[PDB]
Amino acid sequence: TEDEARRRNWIERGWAPWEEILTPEADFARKSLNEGEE
Amino acid sequence: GTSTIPGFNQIQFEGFYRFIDQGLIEELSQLVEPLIKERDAVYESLTYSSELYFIGNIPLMNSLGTFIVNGIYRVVINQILQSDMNHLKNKRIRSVADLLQDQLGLALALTTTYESFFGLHPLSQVLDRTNPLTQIVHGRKLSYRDIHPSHYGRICPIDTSEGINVGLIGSLSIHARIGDWGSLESPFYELVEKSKKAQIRMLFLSPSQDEYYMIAAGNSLALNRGIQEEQVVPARYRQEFLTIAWEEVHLRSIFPFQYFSIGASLIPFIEHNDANRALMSSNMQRQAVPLSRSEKCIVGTGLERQVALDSGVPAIAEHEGKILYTDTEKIILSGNENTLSIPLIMYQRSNKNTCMHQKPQVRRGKCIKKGQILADGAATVGGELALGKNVLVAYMPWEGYNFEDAVLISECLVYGDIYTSFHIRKYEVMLGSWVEGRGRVIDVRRVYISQKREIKVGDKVAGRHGNKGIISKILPRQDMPYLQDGRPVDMVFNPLGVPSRMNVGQIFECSLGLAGSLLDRHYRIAPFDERYEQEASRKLVFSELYEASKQTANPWVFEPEYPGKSRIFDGRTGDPFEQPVIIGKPYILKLIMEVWALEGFGVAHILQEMLTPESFRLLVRELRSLALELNHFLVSEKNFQINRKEV
Amino acid sequence: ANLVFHNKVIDGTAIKRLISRLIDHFGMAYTSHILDQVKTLGFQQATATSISLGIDDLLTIPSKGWLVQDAEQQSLILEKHHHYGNVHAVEKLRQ
Amino acid sequence: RGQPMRDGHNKVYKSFSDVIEVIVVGPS
Numbered sequence: 001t002e003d004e005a006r007r008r009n010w011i012e013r014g015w016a017p018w019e020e021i022l023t024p025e026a027d028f029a030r031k032s033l034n035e036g037e038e
Numbered sequence: 039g040t041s042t043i044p045g046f047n048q049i050q051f052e053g054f055y056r057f058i059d060q061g062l063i064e065e066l067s068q069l070v071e072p073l074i075k076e077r078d079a080v081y082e083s084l085t086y087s088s089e090l091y092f093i094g095n096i097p098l099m100n101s102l103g104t105f106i107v108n109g110i111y112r113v114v115i116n117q118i119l120q121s122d123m124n125h126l127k128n129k130r131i132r133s134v135a136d137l138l139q140d141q142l143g144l145a146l147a148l149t150t151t152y153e154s155f156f157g158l159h160p161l162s163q164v165l166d167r168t169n170p171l172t173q174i175v176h177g178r179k180l181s182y183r184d185i186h187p188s189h190y191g192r193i194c195p196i197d198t199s200e201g202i203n204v205g206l207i208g209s210l211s212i213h214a215r216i217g218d219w220g221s222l223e224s225p226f227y228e229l230v231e232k233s234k235k236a237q238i239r240m241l242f243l244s245p246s247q248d249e250y251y252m253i254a255a256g257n258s259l260a261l262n263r264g265i266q267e268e269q270v271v272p273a274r275y276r277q278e279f280l281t282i283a284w285e286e287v288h289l290r291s292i293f294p295f296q297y298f299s300i301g302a303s304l305i306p307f308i309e310h311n312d313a314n315r316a317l318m319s320s321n322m323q324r325q326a327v328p329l330s331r332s333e334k335c336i337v338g339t340g341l342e343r344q345v346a347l348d349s350g351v352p353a354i355a356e357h358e359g360k361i362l363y364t365d366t367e368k369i370i371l372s373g374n375e376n377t378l379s380i381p382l383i384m385y386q387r388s389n390k391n392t393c394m395h396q397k398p399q400v401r402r403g404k405c406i407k408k409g410q411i412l413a414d415g416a417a418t419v420g421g422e423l424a425l426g427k428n429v430l431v432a433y434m435p436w437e438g439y440n441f442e443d444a445v446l447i448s449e450c451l452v453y454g455d456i457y458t459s460f461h462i463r464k465y466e467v468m469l470g471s472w473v474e475g476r477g478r479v480i481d482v483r484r485v486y487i488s489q490k491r492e493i494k495v496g497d498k499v500a501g502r503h504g505n506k507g508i509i510s511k512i513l514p515r516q517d518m519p520y521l522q523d524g525r526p527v528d529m530v531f532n533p534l535g536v537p538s539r540m541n542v543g544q545i546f547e548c549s550l551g552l553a554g555s556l557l558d559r560h561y562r563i564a565p566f567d568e569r570y571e572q573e574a575s576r577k578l579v580f581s582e583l584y585e586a587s588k589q590t591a592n593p594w595v596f597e598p599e600y601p602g603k604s605r606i607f608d609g610r611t612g613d614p615f616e617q618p619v620i621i622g623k624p625y626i627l628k629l630i631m632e633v634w635a636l637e638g639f640g641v642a643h644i645l646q647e648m649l650t651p652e653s654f655r656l657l658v659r660e661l662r663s664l665a666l667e668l669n670h671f672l673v674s675e676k677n678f679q680i681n682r683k684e685v
Numbered sequence: 686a687n688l689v690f691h692n693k694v695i696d697g698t699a700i701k702r703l704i705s706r707l708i709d710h711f712g713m714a715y716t717s718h719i720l721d722q723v724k725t726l727g728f729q730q731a732t733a734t735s736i737s738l739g740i741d742d743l744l745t746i747p748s749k750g751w752l753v754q755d756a757e758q759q760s761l762i763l764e765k766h767h768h769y770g771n772v773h774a775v776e777k778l779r780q
Numbered sequence: 781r782g783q784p785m786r787d788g789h790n791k792v793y794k795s796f797s798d799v800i801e802v803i804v805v806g807p808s
Binding site: 270281434435436438536537542545546576579580600601603606608616618619620 | 728729731732733734735736737738739740741742743760761764
């Protein structure tokens, strides 16, 4: 499930949701591409 | 091959050395020099071979990569076989070493096995000896349809066959080489970091290694307010094209002739021609007849000298020294208390009935280095391939006599002997007779008859840009159009053939050829001169045209209103032609449902004549062999009586 | 003969239409002779004018340099922002 | 029948069923 895999990534592979400080262009790209293409 | 163009026969040469040095023992688990000479094996129709100790005979290879089997020159071509299935890293090349080693293994499971291999194996082919170019390119063929990215620098993308084998018989690139796993390798210049020895920066890459290097073909002539390392160039990577900074480039392709075969590399201004015409040009240059008098091209690529050296057509000194004696038959060279006599080929027939003939290029008392030229063969002047002539040419329609690919020529090409060639035909009579096939008996062993053929209506001519034509009309010099200096032109080509075929390179060549003749200059220009600057060919041609016009006081040569073109006059009337015409001196070579239609017209009796019955009587007997009878009965419309036709 | 007087230009489609009208009006024997005469006239005039082809005659439109340089600028800017992660590879491919 | 009869030179025999089944321009 998507609870043990996340825990597995943290413990075994050292995953952490580190903050990504994005430029306005990068911030727009992630927010707009979730809606569609054009 | 790291800093020069390699010998064109190096693949054949090195492969045969591997067979003798290592191949023999791998199959046997002494060699005696041949008792006869190569010229003897041809005269007596024997085989140039060596004795294995007496197990049998092993055919030997010449330095030109050719074998002499029963007097016939033979060449073993390279085969490409499966080791993306079309990637060259999944392919492998089997050369003469692989084939001769298989025959030896087949032989040990020794003479008749090799005679049968050369006579019957499809990879053993009779050497094409039409001209020096045909000899050198035959041994570089690859026999198996689409171009693959892995081919770049290894297999020529242009040179292929025309017909149904297209894409299955190709040519090796000029700088290509066979690796240690039957793989083709091409040299690239390595861009090395600061901290590394890197003695030789030229390295050969197999197709497997090619995808994972960033290879750029651009130059570093670009600067802005930043730094040079951040400028971008087109590069190849992972079988695609990118645009990346110079600092991310791993390798550079720097050799001018790296990506093309020999035939494509002899086309000046090739980057101004459509790629389809460059293929047709390669085929036409292989059909060019050696002329009785030979002449260097005014404009070339610079590869003509390499072809002359590697073809073996000229005579090159095997030893340094001084020249003591020259005549039509021999040249005597002495150096370091050793005297050598070198016979000269005279009026010898080739495979395709062309004339081979050597003329001395040195005089008495001339010092020679080892490997320098001594005599010029047919279609070779001064150590350069010379397949044609430079003639005065105008591009204009002329009363329909140059309609489509037809070509109009002047009589001066006939009585000037510009395109006269010798053709020796061997038929299996007193010497020197004039038999009538008209010709002169030159040698009786077999009767050899020599023909001197001048240019004629119906003969085919061609440039180096896929511009091929057929002579349709020969005019007196006073009927030809003539220039502002009064000289009539020698040939008139149709200008409508250029835009449809999209071969602009012939336009550059003819203009530059005219400038060279007036300036007493020849030009050897590597392809893709646009890498230096935009319109590099235009700048070179126009500047040389202006210099020729200025130095010789011939203002018509360079017209500022329309460079390259000039007003010319009609020889018949003396009136000028209305529009300016491009004139020049290019290098021109001389080359070596019906039933349904009748039924559609309703011509029943014509169809009956063209068919005539034995075709049907034979059909009845073959059907009788299958226990079937086919009887033809006629029923009379008058009395209804049935008649069995005699079939 | 009541032939119309053409006074503008005779191109490929104009001559094809005229021949078809000549065939329908005069028949094929007349038009066959007309074709031979028109063919001869065309060859003679093409020679007298002497159309040719030079480097200068291969005319590029004046604005190519402006248009190519604009396309290069847009591609160059998009390649930078692709490296920054502002557009993805398919968007760069399409553009 | 399947694999057809072949001779010594590895050639398949043909039955009766197999048996039954220059120019120059002149403008003037």
